[PDB]
Amino acid sequence: KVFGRCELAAAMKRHGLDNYRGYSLGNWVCAAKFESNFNTQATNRNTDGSTDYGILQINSRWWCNDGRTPGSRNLCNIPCSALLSSDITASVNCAKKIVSDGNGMNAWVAWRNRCKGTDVQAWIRGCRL
Ligand SMILES: [Cl-]
Ligand SMILES: [Cl-]
Ligand SMILES: [Cl-]
Ligand SMILES: [Cl-]
Ligand SMILES: [Cl-]
Ligand code: NA
Numbered sequence: 629k630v631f632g633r634c635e636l637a638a639a640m641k642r643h644g645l646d647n648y649r650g651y652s653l654g655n656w657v658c659a660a661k662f663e664s665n666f667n668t669q670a671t672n673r674n675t676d677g678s679t680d681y682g683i684l685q686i687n688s689r690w691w692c693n694d695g696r697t698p699g700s701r702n703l704c705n706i707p708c709s710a711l712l713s714s715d716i717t718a719s720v721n722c723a724k725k726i727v728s729d730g731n732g733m734n735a736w737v738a739w740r741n742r743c744k745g746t747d748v749q750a751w752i753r754g755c756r757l
Contacts, residue, residue: 654748682711
């Protein structure tokens with residue numbers, strides 16, 4: 629599923645991401661835009677053999693099991709394929725664990741390079757929330 633901007637904002641708000649660990653909703657929408665272009669089916673392979681999955685490009689090196697990342701962890705206790713669903717619940721719940729692990733949203737490279745320090749409220753401007 630390719631979300632619209634306001635559609636995704638509303639879904640993330642319903643799932644408790646607005647101001648989660650102090651990160652306003654626009655931070656999460658901005659991260660999703662630049663990580664996946666709002667596409668739940670996005671995958672990308674990393675140099676070390678791990679793979680990033682879904683709307684927030686969660687990495688199999690630490691967070692999910694895809695059966696092809698030897699020596700990795702599965703800290704969200706999910707198969708990576710669950711992060712590709714049209715229902716974003718699994719991605720949001722895993723993202724909550726990630727952002728709570730000490731480094732905040734700096735875990736998302738695209739957030740750090742394209743969202744951090746910008747006017748992220750623009751990503752939810754005009755949306756009915
Ligand atoms: Cl957009
Ligand atoms: Cl915001
Ligand atoms: Cl594995
Ligand atoms: Cl949902
Ligand atoms: Cl933080
Ligand atoms: Na893994």
